[PDB]
Design a protein around this ligand. Structure first.
Ligand SMILES: CSCC[C@H](N)[PH](=O)O
Ligand SMILES: CSCC[C@H](N)[PH](=O)O
Ligand SMILES: CSCC[C@H](N)[PH](=O)O
Ligand SMILES: CSCC[C@H](N)[PH](=O)O
Lengths: 396, 396, 396, 396
């Protein structure tokens, strides 16, 4: 049949993939090659003119990576996909394909740190200006739009407190003003949120997180209309960033995404249990999790997301020193950056990543001294809870 | 001892590598990971502040990739290396790190096609203008320099006829005017040419070609001063292109480069034999190979290159149709783009890659209708010669 | 803490693994090496004498494979593990380590085909005799025991109709007579059955099936007492079969087993739904599945197994031709041998694998003309059911 | 054409390989799969009956591994190849396929240690007796033959002093008496010696050594007549040892063997230079190297071998303590077991591997207290010589 007709779990397993045509191999072969051989001058010419299907060179395209791209296009309900060397490369390949000197972007302020760095420091040096706004307030997005605005850029849920952005509303605002909406869907995966179905034009992911899910791949993906993806591929990737994905990385990501449905279900079931535990703990001042009814945008979450996600942020009593004590007291949770791994990961930005940053600078970014971010893994939730309880009690 | 003190073959094998510290494993382990775990909040903070050695996240750095970077820095006699997702990414990460809106670049015209596309179409759209010149004439480089020129960019030998550029002379001209010289050393590898030793500031490679050598990796490398590489890493790669190399790709490239010395010796020995055969063949109008005494810049080649390389271009009698007939008549040489593989590769641009291009447009790029490019592999040269003789005779 | 103290899901994720000591890498590094380097003659001597921890050579042991071995030992509640090149190698390394000329084995008859071949044809040619019995009847096992019997060998559930063997009862019988009990636990995985906890001495798996779960690894594992595993390693593997596992295969298996808990839960939930559908279908004469109350050994299953498994066998009305028609009519289920993959796999032995076999020979092995074996994957069960319904209806 | 018609270097690069049929990928794809899918019941049946070409299951066969098997068959001038999990598995799969209880083997005494262990301790326990002889004396081989002798087994050059065995003469003796000759060709590779061309029936290798050459694969290969290889595959491997090779390992070995010709040339050129240096050194009592005219079987070597190999053994003045001092004093050579890597490896058996062994037991095996074994790598020979000179001088 057509893989676009099956249930979502069936698609996760099968979409974009098929047994190898020459051998019947069930696993997608790893086409770890740089180049491809033609049977004749004519076949070569036909492919370079695009009068013929087939491969030429891995930077341009590759059968293993094509399977991943097609799978993710199916899962996001987009026309086409483009795999990249990293999440950052997915974002920059996208924006550098769309924008040129004199153009403007309206971006959420509550975004991934490195994305913020690209937008605030690099883009302007190429003559592309960026206005940062609070995207939880769609009116701020409207107010910042200019005649030269080409793109509105958002993430939801957002760092660090998992605030939300109303995708459908923002899409309508962007489109009314003739701009595209690009959504970073990394935190949710297509299993939990589908920005294209809500009106977004382009979705990007760091597959480094949930899509791969196994903490062993750096990579990104872009999904959108064929006409845009063709430009992102044959100009953005080919000429500008050169950020192609290794066939081995694509194969690992294909392998990891096979279990996306069951992983997300467990991540989110575990996260809800842990979030409820934290919300009841007298040493914890705040818990940020879309699945708690106390979330300021709970109702939007119920409309836009199928599950509340696997990430929790929370604030511990006693600020900086308590956060440090707590994170140094966990025995099961692992101190690391990143998220979406099978192992539970924990970080305390004020004493770790953002130690080098001024306290007032941290606050403006929504990072309080006691803020802890937890990526909930696939362990027994009782074990994670017991580890957190132990560490919190010691710290406070 | 210090690996920088050994002979070049010893360095090829050993530089940048060591047995694994925890296990003694001889092969560099494949650190196919996204993230790294800290033992404490304090250790995490120290690494983010750069007060401590150690890893954080593979996009920023990785032990496997670090070995490759250090090895290539040693081989090029540069301070530091930076691995990338592709040769293109090495070039663009370099130039986008160095240049901003209002800046200017002077570039050779005889350069890699996709590089030409980036420089001619993409850079100007970011407000960075490029002047193209004939770099075989250092005076044209001087004449094109402007107060805003930041970079002079060259490749040598150059496509498609393997003309040369005088690195030392061009370096002096660039430096007198306060610009950096960037050299694409892909065709030669560090075994055959060392641009940094001749005054270049930065060297880039597609490792897809000779450095890896096994036709199974797309990748690039940048070598230069520590201060520049630090910016290329923590700004160019981290924020702008996102073009990081997969640890698996770095491991394959480490593995491939182990045999760089013996491969280049054989590629070049084979190429010289084939070039001499072609030069004596009455159906071949021209042969472009630095190792032939008839090369217009032969003497420069002898001063700048340790070996004449593994690439040959030649023109067959009878133009377009003869080139097509010939390439369709080889039985051993493989019709493919790319170069530097263990297999002999052949292409006829006018009937293949550049078929879609106007004949006069091809000519301006130095591509005549009968021009064939041959990447000489590791086969017995008698077999390659016999295959060429057979195909040439049939075609003419 | 100690990984043996955590919940089973926590163990699945964490047991046998730790961040890399030298780098903190979260993913177990792929130690794809043949040999290991010593810091001194003395260190080498200490390791060969076994007076020192550390590695020597990958056939003897490897850090990546050691992690897998330790994880599986934890999951089966055994002392030690030994990884192998295949499930077959796990079985033969085990039995060839234990048995010599003149020894005897009592084996179940309802076992994996290739195991049956080894036991019936190869063992006797080495002077090791085997008696085959119906292991669903523990009294047949007792009756076949001889003074020279060293081993009783069983699989449960068994091929092809998923009959069971009472592990605890058989263990007691074997031990009373001074024999070891070896159990092939492939069909269940440690998540669903724990033979060592029921008195078995040694457990073997083809990790090719559920433990890896991703249809991309051939491999085996042996778990048992340290003293036995040491002999299986330093004699059986080192000298006799040479069946060591590649570090890359061990790494993939580690990666696959991370999701064992969530995969088995979904496989079994899906299988129960499909089995109930089949049991209600008028074109299906019989359904063999431990989770159906009509299973002849249902109660034993409830005592010995935590879940009913992901495999179903069933008989279609109309025998050979109907089975052929049905299997040629599925659109989602894939025609293939093997089991435990994320994709649903289906086979019809009488028209496929056992076509070359005489009908009466097939019957003696429990293979009827209409018997179909289904390995239930991770797709939406509604999609699998609809595919089966469609194919069954067309066929009957 | 036919790959069996090209020169040996051409065969090394091309034999057994072809661009991928579905995509044209130049690198042999990594078919990292367990199973294969059939298009119909009929296609499945045809393959199991062997009425049809195609794959079924990786333990039985795999497209990546098939390429390696075919390549090595071409290089050894044998009909067919069979890849295995290790060199040991190549040997035992071979001998356990050929021999049964009551059979007899005549083996060289100067053989690989683990092979000796299998033959002396394991085989007899399966009722297969082995007579060990000095194979440098073909008359000892004849004298040990019995009516039940099925196989004569030899290695050449032999451990530890690189003595030789006259393959052609021994083949004639074996055949006159109705036995097969099996030759372990690991030390030479097919580039330096071709036992099948001299009358051997079966060749085995540890590909862990020179064939792979990169110190990152454990693996073996068997080459012989189709009828024998079919039995070794469908009985020996399938049922008995289960020692199949991982497709990834086969792919790495294919990749490594591409440079076999150029590697062996350099290994042997380097080894001859080092051997001559050692022969002139007053602190070195003996040097064992086939390339020295003082070798007791020099003339046989010139007739049987195309190059003298990359391995050297030598004895240092001062026995055990001097050997220990010397090996602890090298700075470039790496202390490790194994051989055939790109790095120079060194070991001193009396103070390392064989420390746990009684001095008189070592002597009987040809291991003197001052004996050092050197696997010469691809480094500059001047650097290796300088390292050896430094270490020898310090030690003596
Ligand atoms: C900038 S270093 C890497 C940071 C992780 N991507 P974050 O913890 O998801
Ligand atoms: C733009 S497709 C790839 C072209 C090869 N890099 P050229 O043949 O080296
Ligand atoms: C003997 S070919 C392989 C057969 C699979 N192991 P069965 O379908 O689990
Ligand atoms: C028995 S441990 C491994 C020993 C190496 N194969 P030898 O040094 O070639």
């Amino acid at each position: 049949s057509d893989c676009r007709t099956y249930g979502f779990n069936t698609q996760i397993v099968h979409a974009g993939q098929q047994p190898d045509p020459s051998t019947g191999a069930l696993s997608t072969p790893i086409f770890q090659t740089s180049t491809f051989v033609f049977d004749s001058a004519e076949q070569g010419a036909a492919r370079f003119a695009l009068e013929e299907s087939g491969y030429i060179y891995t930077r341009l395209g590759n059968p293993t990576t094509d399977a991943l791209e097609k799978k993710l296009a199916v899962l996001e309900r987009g026309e086409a996909g483009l795999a990249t060397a990293s999440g950052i490369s997915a974002i920059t390949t996208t924006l550098l394909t769309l924008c040129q000197q004199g153009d403007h972007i309206v971006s959420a302020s509550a975004i991934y740190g490195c994305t913020h760095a690209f937008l605030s420091h690099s883009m302007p040096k190429f003559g592309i200006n960026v206005s940062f706004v609070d995207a939880a307030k769609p009116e701020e997005i409207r107010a910042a739009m200019r005649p030269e605005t080409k793109v509105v850029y958002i993430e939801t849920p957002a760092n660090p407190t998992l605030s939300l952005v109303d995708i459908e509303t923002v899409a309508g605002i962007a489109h009314q003003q003739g701009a595209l909406l690009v959504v970073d869907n990394t935190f949710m995966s297509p299993y939990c949120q589908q920005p294209l179905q809500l009106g977004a034009d382009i979705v990007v992911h760091s597959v480094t997180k949930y899509i791969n899910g196994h903490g062993d791949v750096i990579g990104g993906i872009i999904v959108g209309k064929q006409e845009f993806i063709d430009q992102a591929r044959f100009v953005g990737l080919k000429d500008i960033t050169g950020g192609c994905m290794s066939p081995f990385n694509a194969w690992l990501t294909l392998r990891g995404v096979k279990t996306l449905g069951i992983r997300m279900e467990r991540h989110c079931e575990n996260a809800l249990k842990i979030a409820r535990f934290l919300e009841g703990h007298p040493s914890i001042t705040r818990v940020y999790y879309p699945g708690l009814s106390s979330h300021p945008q709970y109702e939007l979450g119920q409309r836009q997301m199928s599950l509340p996600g696997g990430i929790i942020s929370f604030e511990i009593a006693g600020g900086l020193e308590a956060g440090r004590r707590m994170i140094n007291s966990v025995e099961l949770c692992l101190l690391a950056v990143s998220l979406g791994d099978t192992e539970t990961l924990i970080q305390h930005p004020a004493s770790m990543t953002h130690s080098p940053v001024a306290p007032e600078e941290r606050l403006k970014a929504g990072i309080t001294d006691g803020l802890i971010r937890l990526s909930v893994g696939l362990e027994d939730p009782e074990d994670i809870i017991n580890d957190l309880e132990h560490a919190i009690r010691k710290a406070t």
